[PDB]
Amino acid sequence: LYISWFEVAEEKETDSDGNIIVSGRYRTKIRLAHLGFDGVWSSGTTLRE
Amino acid sequence: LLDTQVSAKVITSRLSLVTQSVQQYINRIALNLEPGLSINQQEATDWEEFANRYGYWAANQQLRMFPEIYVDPTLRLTKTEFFFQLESALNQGKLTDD
Amino acid sequence: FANRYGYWAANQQLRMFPEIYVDPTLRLTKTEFFFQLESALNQGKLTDD
Amino acid sequence: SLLYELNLGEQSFVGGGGWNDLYQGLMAGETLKLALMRMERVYVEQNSRRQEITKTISLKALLGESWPAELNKLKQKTPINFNLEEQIFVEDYQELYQRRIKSVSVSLPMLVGPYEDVCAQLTQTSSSYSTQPNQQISLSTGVNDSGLFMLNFDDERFLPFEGSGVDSSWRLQFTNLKQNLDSLNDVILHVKYTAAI
Amino acid sequence: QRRIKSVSVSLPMLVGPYEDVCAQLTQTSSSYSTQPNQQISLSTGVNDSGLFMLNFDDERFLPFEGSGVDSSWRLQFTNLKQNLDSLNDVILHVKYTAAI
Amino acid sequence: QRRIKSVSVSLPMLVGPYEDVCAQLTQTSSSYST
Amino acid sequence: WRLQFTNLKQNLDSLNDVILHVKYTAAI
Amino acid sequence: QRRIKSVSVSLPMLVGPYEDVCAQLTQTSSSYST
Amino acid sequence: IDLYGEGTPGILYQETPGAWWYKSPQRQIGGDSNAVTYGAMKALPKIPRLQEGATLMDINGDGRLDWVITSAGVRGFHSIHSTGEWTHFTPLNTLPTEYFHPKAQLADLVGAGLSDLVLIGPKSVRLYANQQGNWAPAQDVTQAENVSLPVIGIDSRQLVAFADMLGSGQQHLVEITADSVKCWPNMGHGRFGQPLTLEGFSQPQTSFNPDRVFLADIDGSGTNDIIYAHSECLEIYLNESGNRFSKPISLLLPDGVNFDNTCQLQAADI
Amino acid sequence: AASDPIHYRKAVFNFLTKNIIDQGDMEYRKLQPSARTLARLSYSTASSL
Amino acid sequence: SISPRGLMKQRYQRVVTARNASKMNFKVPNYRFEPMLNRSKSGVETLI
Amino acid sequence: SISPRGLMKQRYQRVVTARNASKMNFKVPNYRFEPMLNRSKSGVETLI
C-alpha cells in the first residue's frame, strides 16, 4: 500500500516588510509514503515541491 | 519427468512419479523459468506448505473437509486489538465475571 | 630456504607458481590504506557504503 | 579516563581561564562543576550495557604448522615474539558497531609436581590499533592464570590490557630458573572482550 | 500483576576443548510491555547468561529486565564454520515477578 | 520473649532435572502477633 | 559454665563427648 | 596480654536429617574479666 | 587409588598445592607372605591438579588413570602410567557434557569398563555415547510409561544407588527406604524393566536416617549386601540369593567406641 | 609473482566461479525434494568451462 | 493447523511490534535512579 | 608462504607500534574517575 498527502505550503511572499500575502509566490509539499511490510508506513518523502 | 538411469531394481509407483513430476513443473514455474503463470505468492506458498508433500496436502484436505471436529478456536485467524485486549483481561489477576 | 631441501623446494615451488593459491587475502604490499581497509572490513556488519 | 570508557575520540570540555588575575580566578570550580555534570550526563548516556563475551584459544592452532619449531624455541630459554589477529577474533558475532578488549587469562598444562616453580612473563608488544609502564604480566600458579589474585574488582590493579584494541601483538617468556619445562604442550588463552551493537 | 524479571538459557552438547560455543538471542519484541542492547550473545552452553556477573544492581543487565511476559524472539548460532550437528533442545530458565 | 524470624520448606520428590515444582503457601494468620 | 539440653524425648542415650573450638587473642 | 575472642562447639551424634538438636550453654562467669 | 598396576591402592593425600604423598602398601618384614603395611609417601612431578574436574579415573579403559581436564573451556586429560609417566596433555576431540547438575550422573549401564554419563530420572532417559573414552552423539529415549520411575536426590530418610544387589555385574538401580527396597531390571540401551522389591529388612522408621548405611557386597556373590550402624553395633543384612535378605548380624563395635556422624566406615582388602 | 603484470590473475575469476557453483552444490547438499532443479545452475557454471 | 496458529501468533507479534518497537523507548540501566537521586539533589542544593 | 605472511604481519605490528608506543600514553587506573569525582568536587566547593 501507498499513501499520499499534500501540505498546501501557503507561502508568505510579500515584497513589503510585512508578509501578509501568502501567494504571488508559492510552494507546495507533495508527499507520499509506502506501507512498510511490517505495517510501519515509511516515514514518507516529498515527491516534489 | 526426473527420468533417470538410476534403477537398482527399486520398485516405484506411477502415481508417485507423476506426482513428483507435477511438482517439477510447479517448481519450474515457481522459480522463474520458461514463462509460467507464477501465481500470487500466497498460492505459491500454499503449494510449498501443503502440496509440497502428500501428507502435507492430505492434512490440508482433511481440514478443508472438516465441518468441525477440533477447529476449537482457542485462537484464530480473526483478530483485532480486541483480541489482545481480551487476552489481557484473561491474564490479569484471577478470573471473574466482571 | 636453502637451509633445507624442502625449505628450498617450497621456495622454488612458489617461485614457479604463476598463481594457484597466492590468494592475497594479505600481502607484502601495504600502506596505512591497508589497515584502513581492514577497519572498514571489521567495523559493524558489511555494507556497500 | 572518561575517554577511555567513552572512546568518542578526543574532545575537550575542560577549559582554561578558571583562574584569572584580575578576578582572582573566583569561579574555576564552578566551571569544573559544569564540565563534570555534563560529562556525567554523557557517562550515563553512553554506558550502555555494552555487549561482552569471552572465548579461548590454542596458540598452536593459531600459529599453524610453524608451531612445532615455535614451541621448540619456546622450550629453549629465550623470550619470543607473538601475535593476535583481530579478524580471526571477529570471526564470531561479526556484526557489532564496536569491538574492544575487556580482559584475558591464560594457562599451561603443568607437569611440575606438588608445588614447583611455575614461572613466566607476558606482555603485548602493542595493541597497534587502539583508541612498557604496566602493560605486562608475570605468570605462575597454573590454572587460568590471571597473574593476579583478584575477583573482577574495579579499582587499582587491572589487566594490562583493559579496553585494548582487539588487535594486539605480544612478547612472551618463561623465566628459566635453571629448571625443566620441556614436557609441555600448547598454552591456552581465555580472552574477554566487548562490543557495541 | 505479572512481569518479567530476567532469564538464562542453556544448550546440551557433547563438545570439546576451547571450541566456539557461540550464539546470539534477542526478543524481537515483548509486544505487550509497560535493538539498542536488546540482545545477548552466548558462549557458555550451561546456564548461559551471556554475562559474567552475579545478580548486581547497576549497569550490566540482561537485555530484558521488566519486560512483558509476552515476548517473541530471534535466535542464532554463529557458524564459525564448526560442527553443531549433534545438538539437542534448548532449556530455558525464565525469571519473573508478579503482584498478588 | 518468643517470635518468628523466618522459615523455608521443601518436599520429597525429584520432579526432574528441570521439572515443574510449583506451589503456593501463606499463613492464613499468625493469630497472635504484636 | 552451665550447659544443658532440652528433653524432647530424643536419642539422648546415644551421645558421646563434645568438641570445643575456642578463639582468643593476646598482646605480644 | 591474653583474652577471649570467640568460640564454636559441636556434638558427635548422627541424629538424622530432620531430627532434634536442643542444647543451651552459658558461662556462669568469666571470673577474671577486665 | 591404585595407579601402579597394584591391584590394591596407594593412599595419596594430595591437594592443590598438593603433597602427592603416595603412601602405599608394602610387605611387612617377617611373618607370612600376607603381612603388609603402608610405607613412605612419594610426591612426584605432576599435572595442574586444580580447577579441572581433576579426578582419579581411567575413563578410556586403558589400565591407566586419566587425570581429568574439564575446566572453563579446557577439556582433555593426562594419562599416567604405572611408572608414574604422566603423559603429555591429551586433547582428543573429547565431547564432554554440560554436567549441568552433577546430580544423577550415570556410569555403568552403557557397558562394563566403558562407563558413561547420563543425567536422568522419571519419564525420560538421556543417552550415553562413550566408546573407549570417545563419543558419538548422545540421544533421548524413554522406557515405557507404565514402568516405575527411579528418581534421585530426595534426602527424605532414604538412599539410592546404582548397585547390583542381584550380583549380575549390572549395577542395577535400587531405591532404599527404612521399610521397602526396589530394584529395576537392567534394560541397557534406553531402558529398565519394572522394578522388583526385595524383602528381609526394616528399621524403626521414625528413628531412621538416610545413611548410617553401607552397601558393599560381602558374601562374595556380587549381590550387594547391607550394613546399618547402631548406637553400639552394626546390623548386617545379607542378600538371599539376590532376592531377599537373611536375619541381620549384630556386630559389637570396638569397646568404648560408638560410631556417629563424624565416623566413617569403609571396606577394602587389607 | 603476487604482483606480476600478467593476466594469470584471471585465476581469481576461475576460483570465484567454482565458489559460486560450490555454494549452490552445498545448498543442494541440503535435503530438498527439488533436489536437481536449481542445480541446473551448477550445470551452467561447470559447462561454462 | 496449530502450526498456522503458530504462524499467526508470530506475525501478530510482528504487527504489534510495529507499534511497540517505538514503545521499547530507551529504558535506562536498571536501579540507576536510586544513586542518581544523590547527584541530582546535590545539583539542586548547589543552586541554593 | 603464510609464514612470511606471519612475519610481515608481525613487523607490520612493529612499524605501527613505532606510532602506537607513544599512543599507549599512561592510561590510568580503571574507573578511577568515578570515585575521584567526589574528591574533585570537594576541592571545587572548597574554593567557595
3-class SS letters over I179-201: CCEEECCECCCCCECCCEEEECC
Q: Does H21 touch chain I (CB under 8 A)?
A: no
**Contact by Cβ (8 Å): I99, I106:** no
DSSP G1-28: -EEEE--SS-SGGG----EEEEEEE---
Chains that touch A (3 or more CB pairs under 8 A): K
The grid coordinates listed for D164 are: 585494548
The verdict on a CB contact (< 8 Å) between K31 and E58 is yes
Binding-face residues of I in 138-167 toward D, CB within 8 A: none
I249-252 β-sheet, strand order = I213-214, I226-229, I233-237, I249-252
First to last CA, chain E: 7
Residue I25 near residue I2 (C-beta atoms within 8 A): no
Q: How far apart are CA D160 and CA L28, in angstroms?
A: 11
**CA K19 – CA I86 distance, rounded (Å):** 64
Q: Which three cell numbers stand for residue I180?
A: 521397602
Cβ atoms within 10 Å of I251's Cβ, excluding its own: 13
CA distance E72 to K17: 9
Grid coordinates representing H11 are: 556434638
Instruction: Say yes or no: C26 contacts chain L, CB-CB below 8 A.
Output: yes
CB contacts < 8 A, C to J, total 21
Chain J within 8 Å of C17 (Cβ-Cβ)? yes
> In 3-state terms, what secondary structure has residue J40?
helix
* Mutation target among I158, I209, I227 for the H interface, most CBs of H within 10 A: I209
Pairing of strands D188-195, D100-107: antiparallel
Put simply, the answer to whether D44 touches K43 (Cβ < 8 Å) is no
Q: Which residues of L touch C26 (CB under 8 A)?
A: 5, 8-9
CB–CB of H6 and G23 under 8 A? Answer: yes
CA dist., res. I203 & res. I165, Å (int) = 19
Cβ contact C15–J1 (<8 Å):
yes
Task: Give the minimum alpha-carbon distance from E42 to chain I in angstroms, rounded to a whole number.
Answer: 14
CA–CA separation, D133 and D184 (whole Å): 30
Helix K33-47 crosses helix D28-46 at what angle (to 10 degrees)? 160
Instruction: Report resolution (Å) to 1 decimal.
Output: 6.4
Assess contact for C11 and C1: CB atoms under 8 A.
Answer: yes
- Whether E36 and chain I come into contact, CB under 8 Å, resolves to no
Residues 6+ positions from I8 with CB-CB distance below 8 Å: I2, I25, I268, I269
- Phi then psi for residue I258, to 5 deg, are -130, 145
Q: Which residues of H touch I259 (CB under 8 A)?
A: 14
Give how far K20 is from chain B: nearest CA, Å.
13
Q: Which residues pair with E24 in a beta bridge?
A: E41, E76
**What is the C-alpha end-to-end distance of chain F, expressed in Å?**
11
Cα separation, F17 vs F14, whole angstroms: 8
CB D173 within 8 A of CB D78: yes
Closest Cα of chain B to J33: distance in Å?
8
Helix pair D28-46, L33-47: axis angle to 10 deg:
160
Give me E42's grid cell: 552466548
Q: CB of I133 within 8 A of CB of E18?
A: no
* Torsion angle (degrees, nearest 10) of CA C35, C36, C38, C44: 140
Chains J and C touch (3+ CB pairs under 8 A): yes
Asked if K7 has any chain E CB less than 8 Å from its own CB, the reply is no
- B51: DSSP letter: I
Is J38 in the B-facing interface, judged by CB distances under 8 Å? Answer: yes
Looking at the complex, does the CB of residue K40 fall below 8 Å from at least one CB of chain E?
Answer: no
Contacts of K8 in chain B (CB under 8 A): 75-77, 79
Tell which phi-psi region holds residue F14, choosing left (phi > 0), alpha (psi between -120 and 50) or beta. beta
Nearest CA in chain K to E37: K26
Task: Give the number of residues written for chain L.
Answer: 48
Tell me which residue in F12, F15, F16 faces I156 most closely, judged by beta carbons. Answer: F12
Contacts of A37 by beta carbon, 8 Å cutoff, 6+ apart: none
CA-atom Rg of chain C in angstroms: 17
Q: CA of E32 to nearest chain I CA: how many angstroms apart?
A: 33
Question: CA-to-CA distance for D171 and I186, rounded, in angstroms?
Answer: 58
Cα B66 versus chain centre, distance: 15
Compute the distance between CA of residue D166 and CA of residue D161 in angstroms, rounded to an integer. 10
For I229, residues 6+ apart whose C-beta sits below 8 A from its C-beta are: H14, I212, I213, I214, I235, I259, I265
Chains touching chain K at 3 or more Cβ pairs under 8 angstroms? A, B, D, E
* Method used to determine the 3D structure: cryo-EM
Neighbours of E50 (CB within 10 A): 22
Chain D partners within 8 Å of I50 (Cβ): 142-143
**Which chain K residue lies closest to E36 (C-alpha atoms)?**
K26
